[PDB]
Amino acid sequence: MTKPLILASQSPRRKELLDLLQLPYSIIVSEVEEKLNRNFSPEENVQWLAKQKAKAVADLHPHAIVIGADTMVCLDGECLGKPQDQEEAASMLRRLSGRSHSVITAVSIQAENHSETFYDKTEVAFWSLSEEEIWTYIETKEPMDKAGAYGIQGRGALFVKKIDGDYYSVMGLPISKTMRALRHF
Amino acid sequence: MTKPLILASQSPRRKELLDLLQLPYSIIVSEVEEKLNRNFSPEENVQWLAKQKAKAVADLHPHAIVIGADTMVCLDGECLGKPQDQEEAASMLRRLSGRSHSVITAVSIQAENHSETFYDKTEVAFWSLSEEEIWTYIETKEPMDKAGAYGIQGRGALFVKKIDGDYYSVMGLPISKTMRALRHF
Ligand SMILES: OC[C@H]1O[C@@](CO)(O[C@H]2O[C@H](CO)[C@@H](O)[C@H](O)[C@H]2O)[C@@H](O)[C@@H]1O
């Protein structure tokens, strides 16, 4: 028969995006080791992480189709994680200011008879930022929650000059590619 | 940019099946010491073997799209390999005689930004075979280099009553599904 759909992520943004497909699903997550391999490229690491998150849940629901995903913000081969302290979030934002960075989101779809994993990369260009903007933004507490210390939605939007790629992928889920992949499941 | 296509397989049938896509590609020979792990189902093992073959070549040629495949012949959960002795061939054929078995073929497609693995299962039903038929067929030496001790082409074609699935997958490569998957690469 057909298989039930599962989203192995508690990300609010991924939920609103997958809801666009109008395909019923449940959200089920099982924590996994997320320490990245020093010898993997960012492209290899982000796909590996999406793959692990999906597989942990697929192991618990072998008759389902499980979607795992992961997003990284990388600057000059170096990727920025979520800031621990405000001065770190501030340090990240100062680094992103006035230049471009890459946002890479991987998606892994797992089922017993078919698996597929891919990444989608988007170039994000920032206007030059000032300390006031940086700290004002930091106060909102929005940065303290995402990789690279910013979100393209809400107030972070004012920082973005332009993107070359997929806005939805920057939010956390390349929805058109995900929908296209699911047709073959 | 596009990516060159590579078939990680020495199988003549797979080469002739991939030729139907009329896509340019090369074949790369690889020594891969891969074995089944007893804690996997035939479905998990065949997909794992196909992925290892593709990955062994993809690791060496990261810019390409690599295709790996593997086929297993299974009877009631137990899968048959090639008979290293004619008396075994006759043994396998007798098991296969007058009943149905499963031919499971997995395909794995690997690229730096996208990977996909799946299996295709086909039910193959045999006519009740006679000792004469069986032995006479073995004397042809055709079933001695084939998993399950038979081939759906050549004289073995005379043993098959019908299939429910994909004839090309039984030969070693589900071509239509492979072509369809490649469209997303
Ligand atoms: O079957 C040849 C195939 O094996 C590889 C390893 O996968 O290389 C092996 O065989 C070569 C040719 O005989 C040797 O030169 C080499 O040292 C050995 O590893 C592939 O490179 C080759 O295509």
Q: How far apart are CA A142 and CA A99, in angstroms?
A: 21
Q: Is A175 left (phi over 0), alpha (psi -120 to 50) or beta?
A: alpha
| Candidate from B7, B10, B27, B29 with most ligand 1 atoms within 8 A of CB, to mutate | B29
Provide, as residue numbers in chain A, all residues whose Cβ is less than 8 Å from the Cβ of B117: 114-116
DSSP letters for chain B = ----EEE----HHHHHHHGGG----EE----------TTS-HHHHHHHHHHHHHHHHHHH-TTSEEEEEEEEEEETTEEE---SSHHHHHHHHHHHTTSEEEEEEEEEEEETTEEEEEEEEEEEEEPPPPHHHHHHHHTTTSGGGSTTS--SSGGGGGTEEEEES-HHHHHT--HHHHHHHHTT-
> Cα separation of B167 and B87, whole Å?
28
Q: Which residues of B23-61 are buried (b: 16+ CB within 10 A; e: fewer)?
A: eebeebebeeeeeeeeeeebbbbbbbbbbbbbbbbbeeb
Distance CA(B134)–CA(B148), nearest Å, equals 13
- Are A89 and A138 in contact by the 8 Å Cβ rule? The answer is yes
Method underlying the structure: X-ray
Select from A85, A89, A48 the least CA-distant residue to A70. A48
- How far is C-alpha B66 from the geometric centre of its chain's CA atoms? 16
Could you tell me if B113 lies within 8 Å of chain A, comparing CB atoms? Answer: yes
Give A 60-99 residues with CB within 8 A of chain B.
none
Long-range contacts of B173-179 (CB under 8 A, 24+ apart): B173/B13, B173/B14, B173/B17, B173/B18, B173/B69, B173/B105, B173/B107, B174/B105, B174/B107, B174/B120, B175/B17, B175/B18, B175/B20, B175/B21, B177/B107, B177/B118, B177/B120, B178/B18, B178/B21, B178/B67, B178/B107, B178/B109, B179/B21
Beta bridge partners of A103: A73, A122
Please name the residue whose Cα sits nearest to atom 9 of ligand 1.
Answer: B31
What's the CA gap between A141 and A139, in Å, rounded? 5
CA distance linking residue A52 with residue A49, whole number of Å = 5
d(CA B185, CA B173): 18
Does A43 contact B114 at a Cβ distance shorter than 8 Å? no
CA–CA gap between residue A134 and residue A93 (Å, rounded): 7
Residues of B in contact with A110 (CB under 8 A): none
Q: Which residues contact residue A11 at a Cβ distance below 8 angstroms, ignoring those fewer than 6 apart?
A: A69, A172, A173
DSSP states of A11-29 as a string? -HHHHHHHGGG---EEE--
Q: Which residues lie with the beta carbon below 6 Å from any ligand 1 atom?
A: B 29-31
Taking the C-alpha atoms of residue A110 and residue A108, their distance in angstroms, rounded to an integer, is: 6
Q: Give whole-number Cα distances, A74 to A43, A102, A123, B19, B133, in Å.
A: 10, 5, 10, 40, 66
Kindly give, in sequence order, each residue whose CB lies less than 8 Å from that of residue A94, ignoring residues fewer than 6 positions away: A129, A134
* Nearest Cα to Cα of residue B20 among B158, B151, B182: B182
Whole-angstrom Cα distance, residue B165 to residue B105? 11
* Contact between residue A109 and residue A49 where contact means Cβ atoms under 8 Å apart: no
Q: Which of B43, B114, B119 sits opposite A118 (nearest CB)?
A: B114
**Fold of the A1-185 domain:** Maf protein (3.90.950)
Give the start-to-end residue ranges of the domains of chain A. 1-185
Q: Do B116 and A112 touch (CB under 8 A)?
A: no
3-state class (DSSP) for residue A144: helix
The Cα angle at residue A84 between residues A78 and A88, in degrees rounded to 5 = 60
Q: Which two tokens stand for residue B77?
A: 């959960």
Residue of A nearest to B120 (CA): A113
The burial class, CB within 10 Å (0-12 / 13-18 / 19+), for B118 is: buried
Distance in angstroms (rounded) separating the CA atoms of residues B100 and A64: 28
Closest approach atom of ligand 1 to CA B28 = 23
Residue of the nearest CA to atom 18 in ligand 1? B31
B118 vs A: CB within 8 A: yes
